Amino acid sequence: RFLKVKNWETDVVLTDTLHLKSTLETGCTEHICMGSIMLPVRTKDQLFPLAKEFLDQYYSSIKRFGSKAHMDRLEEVNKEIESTSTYQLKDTELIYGAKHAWRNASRCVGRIQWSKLQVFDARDCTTAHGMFNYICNHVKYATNKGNLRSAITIFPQRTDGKHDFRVWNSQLIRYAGYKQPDGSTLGDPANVQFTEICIQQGWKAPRGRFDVLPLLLQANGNDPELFQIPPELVLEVPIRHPKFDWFKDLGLKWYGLPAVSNMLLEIGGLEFSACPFSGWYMGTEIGVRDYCDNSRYNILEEVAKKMDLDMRKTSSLWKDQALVEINIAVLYSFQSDKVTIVDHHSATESFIKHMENEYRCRGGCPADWVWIVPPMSGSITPVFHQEMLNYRLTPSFEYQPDPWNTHVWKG
Amino acid sequence: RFLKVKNWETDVVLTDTLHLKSTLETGCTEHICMGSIMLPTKDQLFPLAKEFLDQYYSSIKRFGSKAHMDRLEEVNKEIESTSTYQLKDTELIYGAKHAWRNASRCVGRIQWSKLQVFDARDCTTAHGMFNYICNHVKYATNKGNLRSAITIFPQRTDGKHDFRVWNSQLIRYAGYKQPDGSTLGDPANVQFTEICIQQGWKAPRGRFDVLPLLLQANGNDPELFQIPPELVLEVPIRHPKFDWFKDLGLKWYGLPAVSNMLLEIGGLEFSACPFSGWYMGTEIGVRDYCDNSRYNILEEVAKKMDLDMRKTSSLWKDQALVEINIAVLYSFQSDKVTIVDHHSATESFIKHMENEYRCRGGCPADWVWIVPPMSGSITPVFHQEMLNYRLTPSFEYQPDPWNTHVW
Ligand code: HEM
Ligand code: HEM
Ligand SMILES: Cc1cc(N)nc(C[C@H]2CNC[C@H]2OCCNCc2ccco2)c1
Ligand SMILES: Cc1cc(N)nc(C[C@H]2CNC[C@H]2OCCNCc2ccco2)c1
Ligand SMILES: C[C@H](O)[C@H](O)[C@H]1CNc2nc(N)[nH]c(=O)c2N1
Ligand SMILES: C[C@H](O)[C@H](O)[C@H]1CNc2nc(N)[nH]c(=O)c2N1
Ligand SMILES: [Zn+2]
Numbered sequence: 001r002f003l004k005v006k007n008w009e010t011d012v013v014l015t016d017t018l019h020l021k022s023t024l025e026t027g028c029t030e031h032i033c034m035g036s037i038m039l040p041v042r043t044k045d046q047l048f049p050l051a052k053e054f055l056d057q058y059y060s061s062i063k064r065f066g067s068k069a070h071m072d073r074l075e076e077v078n079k080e081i082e083s084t085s086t087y088q089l090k091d092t093e094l095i096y097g098a099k100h101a102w103r104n105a106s107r108c109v110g111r112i113q114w115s116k117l118q119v120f121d122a123r124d125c126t127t128a129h130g131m132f133n134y135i136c137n138h139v140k141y142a143t144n145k146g147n148l149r150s151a152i153t154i155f156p157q158r159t160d161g162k163h164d165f166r167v168w169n170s171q172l173i174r175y176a177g178y179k180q181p182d183g184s185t186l187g188d189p190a191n192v193q194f195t196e197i198c199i200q201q202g203w204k205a206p207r208g209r210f211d212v213l214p215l216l217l218q219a220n221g222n223d224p225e226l227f228q229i230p231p232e233l234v235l236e237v238p239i240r241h242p243k244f245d246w247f248k249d250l251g252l253k254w255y256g257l258p259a260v261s262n263m264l265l266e267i268g269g270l271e272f273s274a275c276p277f278s279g280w281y282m283g284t285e286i287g288v289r290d291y292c293d294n295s296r297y298n299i300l301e302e303v304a305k306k307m308d309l310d311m312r313k314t315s316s317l318w319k320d321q322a323l324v325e326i327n328i329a330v331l332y333s334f335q336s337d338k339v340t341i342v343d344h345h346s347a348t349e350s351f352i353k354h355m356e357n358e359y360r361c362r363g364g365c366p367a368d369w370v371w372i373v374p375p376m377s378g379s380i381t382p383v384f385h386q387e388m389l390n391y392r393l394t395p396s397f398e399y400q401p402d403p404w405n406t407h408v409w410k411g
Numbered sequence: 412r413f414l415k416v417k418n419w420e421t422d423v424v425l426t427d428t429l430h431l432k433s434t435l436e437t438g439c440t441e442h443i444c445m446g447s448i449m450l451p452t453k454d455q456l457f458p459l460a461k462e463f464l465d466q467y468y469s470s471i472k473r474f475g476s477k478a479h480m481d482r483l484e485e486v487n488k489e490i491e492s493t494s495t496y497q498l499k500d501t502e503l504i505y506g507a508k509h510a511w512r513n514a515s516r517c518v519g520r521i522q523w524s525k526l527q528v529f530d531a532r533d534c535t536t537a538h539g540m541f542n543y544i545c546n547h548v549k550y551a552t553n554k555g556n557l558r559s560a561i562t563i564f565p566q567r568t569d570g571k572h573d574f575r576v577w578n579s580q581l582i583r584y585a586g587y588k589q590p591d592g593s594t595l596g597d598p599a600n601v602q603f604t605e606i607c608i609q610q611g612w613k614a615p616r617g618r619f620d621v622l623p624l625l626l627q628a629n630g631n632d633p634e635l636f637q638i639p640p641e642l643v644l645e646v647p648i649r650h651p652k653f654d655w656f657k658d659l660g661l662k663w664y665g666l667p668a669v670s671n672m673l674l675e676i677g678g679l680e681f682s683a684c685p686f687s688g689w690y691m692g693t694e695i696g697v698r699d700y701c702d703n704s705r706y707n708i709l710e711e712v713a714k715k716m717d718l719d720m721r722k723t724s725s726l727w728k729d730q731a732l733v734e735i736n737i738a739v740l741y742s743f744q745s746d747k748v749t750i751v752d753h754h755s756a757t758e759s760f761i762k763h764m765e766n767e768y769r770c771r772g773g774c775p776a777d778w779v780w781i782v783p784p785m786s787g788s789i790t791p792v793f794h795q796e797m798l799n800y801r802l803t804p805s806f807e808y809q810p811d812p813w814n815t816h817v818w
Binding site: 003005006008009019022025026027028029030031032033034035036037038283288289292293294295300314315316317319320321323324327328331335343345346368369370373374375376377378379380384385386387388389390391 | 728729
């Protein structure tokens with residue numbers, strides 16, 4: 001079957017056939033659309049089909065489908081599964097699998113870059129100290145003194161689900177949040193519970209507004225351990241505005257490396273529960289979401305105060321005005337310090353080009369409109385006007401429960 | 412079967428049960444989400460009538476009463492005999508209000524129970540339709556103090572005698588392609604403008620010419636009518652800070668009035684049912700003015716502001732966007748023409764959602780449409796999970812008449 005999507009700005013119509021290779025479920029039915037829902041131990045029986053499907057994709061991609069090498073690899077994996085109940089990926093397969101999980105990530109606007117991903121194979125890791133060393137190396141490599149390079153580090157796969165590797169941090173680099181007795185929050189309100197966990201584990205908290213959190217690392221199902229990333233490895237950007245000289249005195253900064261560390265990478269039915277990955281920022285992630293969400297740094301009022309905007313009625317659009325100025329500041333600051341960043345106009349235009357190329361060469365590009373459209377200035381970006389089809393392909397990145405909710409404490 | 416929605420800003424979780432009363436289909440499957448797609452007999456009619464009358468009698472707390480059983484019988488007899496049926500005034504009013512209540516793409520539904528319903532089921536000609544519509548327009552406008560209204564023309568019969576308003580909205584501006592290759596006025600309306608001309612219209616050929624109504628009664632050929640200009644309330648656009656803003660020569664109309672949809676009530680189809688409310692500022696300032704395929708005014712405005720248009724990262728589009736939208740709101744407010752900003756309308760919609768969850772067990776909502784086209788995440792609806800499903804009575808899209816009609 002064929003499905004069409006239209007761009008309502010250009011009248012360009014694309015035809016999706018790739019959705020036919022979709023296995024996982026969306027959450028939607030013919031009677032309900034769950035498109036705006038945020039969050040909607042394997043046996044041998046379920047594993048060989050998943051392995052076979054993956055290896056068929058891999059071998060097609062290298063133009064060796066049905067070759068002796070393809071057939072021998074199927075037989076070898078087959079035997080490994082029946083005898084050991086799992087299997088190991090070849091290095092080439094791991095790399096392919098990680099690149100494809102990114103390519104298939106329908107909530108990611110940055111996918112034009114998918115084929116340029118440095119993969120660090122950390123499957124020989126055994127301890128939390130080992131994980132710390134791997135993660136420092138990834139941070140240093142990815143940071144590259146401001147010239148950011150995409151990377152992912154992949155720790156050993158799940159076995160019985162009792163021996164999981166996990167990074168407890170939601171991102172490798174984030175700021176602490178501290179709930180005060182008066183109910184106000186110092187730092188990032190998103191990180192309060194995690195900060196509290198770190199403190200209980202023995203972290204000495206400086207208790208400021210931008211304290212970089214320690215890494216909390218779990219190897220082989222053991223209790224997690226704390227490590228401080230060397231500060232010289234944490235690139236940060238002080239935020240200033242090109243025209244407003246008082247902007248610097250708001251005391252804002254942000255880190256340059258966006259690096260998600262709490263997702264699960266599935267490749268050929270194997271589950272990599274610790275697979276931190278990083279790219280570079282789109283400005284709005286910081287300027288809109290991190291700074292201006294009511295439940296995050298919430299700076300809108302203080303900025304608009306300083307700008308002397310009319311704040312007595314929402315219809316003056318003071319919030320919208322202060323919002324644009326903050327986002328100008330973020331982009332100006334990163335550019336001035338030569339730290340890679342992309343604005344939402346550039347990123348969305350590139351995404352449309354990527355999506356069109358994917359339809360031509362791949363037969364489709366699963367995309368989640370709710371996530372792809374930037375959180376300011378939606379309709380003056382081309383993605384707002386682009387119909388998208390959302391479906392799930394593997395290899396993939398998936399959510400998983402927070403480890404403090406499930407971990408069996410050893411003591 | 413029972414579904415949760417969470418607001419990620421406030422942690423408020425609501426439980427939806429209303430979706431189980433859902434009739435029509437979404438376009439989505441377990442394999443594919445089509446959430447961002449814009450447009451995805453006697454035997455058939457009785458279940459539809461019964462479903463509707465049950466909910467009606469339930470609403471007036473008379474479910475299972477003799478009057479309920481008697482009406483279901485009377486409608487059954489009428490369908491068996493005539494192949495259709497007629498709604499009581501009370502049913503028509505209830506049905507229209509509920510089609511609005513059920514409109515998953517509408518942010519303004521807190522207002523759904525204050526809808527003036529004009530019953531135009533006795534209309535027979537296009538001049539009649541014109542009269543009804545002028546009366547609707549004048550009532551709704553109310554000298555700037557806008558009141559929500561719908562006018563309901565006769566229902567479909569055999570489908571060869573359709574009433575239709577060919578216009579997409581009652582009030583829109585003409586669009587003309589130039590020898591130049593550019594577009595004068597609204598590029599969205601070029602095809603409709605040519606159809607008007609093809610049928611005789613005296614196109615003044617300007618940037619903001621109120622289109623004529625093109626009205627089809629009883630399946631006949633449509634006829635042209637100019638709405639009396641004193642009935643079309645328009646607003647000149649100026650900025651509270653920028654004295655140069657007026658020189659762009661921008662104006663818009665005060666009355667948003669969709670006229671091309673189909674109202675379905677109890678299986679009956681009302682193919683001409685123009686309805687109107689009042690604007691949310693972004694519809695004009697973001698969409699009408701700034702879409703590239705619309706008036707597309709960002710470049711001109713940015714130039715007048717003397718912003719750096721060399722690089723996208725100066726956010727010159729975003730700066731101008733905000734100013735254009737401040738101007739729209741300021742102008743309407745200054746001329747006392749009802750308008751709502753996107754902060755206010757979305758805050759109201761959240762309150763409405765909570766009311767609907769509490770009093771009805773849910774509220775179908777299409778996040779893609781509900782979140783405003785600017786400043787998305789600084790409005791509360793951005794952080795609100797929404798379930799989208801189709802309830803009846805409903806408003807539905809229908810084919811443009813010029814493709815269907817035979818002359
Ligand atoms: C190279 C520069 C990149 C840019 C500008 C970018 C952009 C983004 C943005 C803006 C989001 C939404 C984030 C949010 O709102 O929470 C996102 C999501 C995501 N991206 Fe990227 N991305 C990049 C690289 C990467 C890389 C290297 C990977 C993995 C190898 C990746 C995989 C993902 C995934 C799985 C999501 C969904 C996250 C979630 O559900 O929370 N992206 N991307
Ligand atoms: C009273 C003030 C109202 C406000 C502020 C409002 C707000 C809106 C907005 C912003 C849209 C999106 C339109 C677009 O982006 O193209 C919309 C759509 C819609 N509204 Fe309302 N609305 C109001 C009254 C009404 C009334 C009176 C009705 C019917 C009785 C109605 C039914 C609908 C329907 C069916 C849609 C979807 C239209 C489509 O799919 O193109 N609304 N509403
Ligand atoms: C690799 C990468 C690159 C990039 N530009 N942005 C990201 C996303 C990071 C940087 N900004 C927000 C954060 O995402 C956090 C995870 N997504 C939100 C979420 C929270 C719960 C479920 O989904 C990741
Ligand atoms: C009753 C009403 C009130 C209001 N504030 N806004 C509207 C919507 C009007 C005023 N601005 C856009 C237009 O709707 C056009 C129809 N929707 C867009 C569309 C185009 C094709 C399919 O769907 C209607
Ligand atoms: C409820 C809603 O799905 C939720 O707030 C989503 C909307 N779109 C988003 N889009 C991006 N890129 N990131 C997000 O966190 C969200 N949040
Ligand atoms: C393709 C996409 O669905 C399309 O651009 C939609 C997005 N959201 C919208 N939202 C509203 N309110 N009105 C619209 O016309 C649209 N257009
Ligand atoms: Zn869906």
